[PDB]
């Protein structure tokens, strides 16, 4: 026996202490590099290389870096694996220059999940892109193409955009990208499909606002009236819409009867209200209002009603429509709260609110929801007496409400493009 660690030291196979070089020590089978002042490193990186704790080289296998704040991959010779791919643990991996490992970010055709695993056979909708993209079972994106994905189709254009609300070829792609193989109602008419997906055959339909025999109506897509000559026209509004830039040039174009407008949600004032009120109330425009709760309790609900009532006085709002409580299947944007589920907590939540606008001196004040709610999670004779606005984008409302009598809106579509306004806005039928 000749060479040997003595403390932080190596002494070398003649009687000399190593000095800034790599040695490699038969007893452990690993690499070791000595610094200028004698001593191993450990815990720290020498050029390509990463001496773990105690000194030892690694190799095949991965380091977390807890200054670089990244994984790092140290290949077969040490050294770390940099512009380029990897195949560890039977998953792809891409590591970028200097030798950070790719995570939840693109690599060409290719994405990396936070893990840093190649996807494969994946959906991806990208916020950076605005879209969803599927990955295939090679990892490339599908481009140009269709894919059968959990049993149904969806066509991939180019760049691999998913397809939505439009045609390719003989087949349409609906709005959550999945060929239609029943019926669509689009364009003033219905669109027949076979249930393999190909167009058989389109009717014109007498849908929406018609103006017949001198009078106006309001037609769904099954082409029933819904009310009488007297159907109102009702949008809603929120800082979605962006800044209205001619009020006047909305109602008339468009023959609007009335506006609910946002006042915000639980906690935030809606960024256009103070402009929407002062220009509706100026013009003499009919309105209601909408808050969009993410109450939880009771507390929550009478926070919500304070809210309410110190809008309305702040901006001197003239009511000709309700005071909306606008209940959803609500979620936190970071995911951490949602909604309660059970319909005994939402029957405490909404009479809270209803009852402390009430006692505000506030009388025309009602719920607002979506059919499916309605018919689940708000199906309770304590909700539903307070429900005469509901939501749902379908053919026919199709939907009775025993406990409400009176006049009330289908809000039945969220896709209506309207003179003076810029993107969809929301329209509803009052009657
Ligand atoms: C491997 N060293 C000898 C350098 C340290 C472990 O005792
Ligand atoms: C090159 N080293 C000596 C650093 C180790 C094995 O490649
Ligand atoms: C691996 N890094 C390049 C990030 C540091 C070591 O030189
Ligand atoms: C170590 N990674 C998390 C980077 C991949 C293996 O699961
Ligand atoms: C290594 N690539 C990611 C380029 C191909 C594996 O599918
Ligand atoms: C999927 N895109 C082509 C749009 C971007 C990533 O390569
Ligand atoms: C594209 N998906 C099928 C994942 C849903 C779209 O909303
Ligand atoms: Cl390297
Ligand atoms: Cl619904």
Redesign the pocket.
């Known amino acids: 026996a000749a060479a040997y660690?003595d403390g932080d030291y190596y002494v070398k196979d003649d009687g000399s202490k190593a000095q800034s070089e790599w040695i490699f020590?038969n007893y452990?089978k690993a690499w070791?590099y000595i610094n200028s002042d004698g001593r191993?490193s450990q815990n720290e990186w020498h050029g390509n290389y990463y001496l773990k704790s105690?000194?030892?080289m690694a190799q095949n296998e991965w380091i977390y870096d807890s200054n670089y704040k990244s994984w790092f991959y140290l290949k077969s010779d040490g050294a770390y694996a940099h512009q380029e791919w990897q195949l560890i643990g039977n998953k792809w991996y891409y590591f970028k220059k200097w030798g950070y490992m790719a995570k939840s970010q693109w690599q060409g055709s290719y994405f990396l999940n936070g893990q840093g695993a190649m996807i494969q056979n994946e959906w991806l909708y990208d916020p950076a892109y605005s879209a969803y993209f599927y990955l295939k079972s090679d990892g490339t994106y599908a481009n140009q193409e269709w894919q059968k994905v959990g049993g149904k189709w969806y066509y991939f254009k180019k760049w691999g955009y998913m397809a939505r609300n439009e045609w390719q070829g003989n087949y349409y792609l609906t709005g959550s990208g999945a060929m239609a193989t029943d019926e669509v109602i689009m364009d003033g008419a219905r669109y027949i499909f076979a249930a393999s997906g190909e167009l058989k055959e389109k009717k014109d339909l007498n849908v929406g606002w018609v103006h017949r025999d001198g009078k106006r109506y309001f037609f769904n897509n099954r082409e029933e009236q819904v009310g009488t000559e007297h159907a109102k026209k009702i949008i809603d509004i929120s800082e979605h819409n962006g800044r209205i830039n001619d009020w006047k040039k909305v109602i008339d174009e468009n023959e609007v009867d009335g506006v609910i407008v946002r006042l915000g949600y639980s906690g935030k004032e809606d960024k256009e209200l103070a402009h929407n009120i002062k220009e509706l109330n100026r013009l003499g425009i009919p309105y209601g209002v909408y808050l969009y709760t993410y109450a939880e309790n009771e507390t929550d609900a009478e926070n919500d009603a304070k809210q309410t009532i110190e809008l309305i006085k702040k901006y001197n709002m003239n009511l000709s429509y309700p005071i909306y409580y606008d209940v959803e299947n609500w979620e936190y944007v970071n995911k951490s709260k949602r909604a309660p589920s059970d319909t005994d907590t939402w029957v405490k939540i909404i009479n809270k609110y209803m009852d402390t606008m009430k006692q505000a001196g506030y009388q025309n004040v009602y719920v607002y929801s979506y059919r499916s709610l309605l018919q689940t999670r708000l199906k309770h004779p304590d909700i539903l007496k307070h429900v005469n606005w509901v939501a749902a984008y379908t053919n026919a409302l199709e939907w009775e409400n025993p406990y409400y009598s009176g006049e009330k809106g289908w809000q039945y579509t969220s896709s209506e493009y309207m003179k003076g306004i810029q993107g969809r806005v929301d329209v509803s039928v009052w009657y």
């Open positions: 660690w020590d452990y070791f191993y105690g000194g030892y």
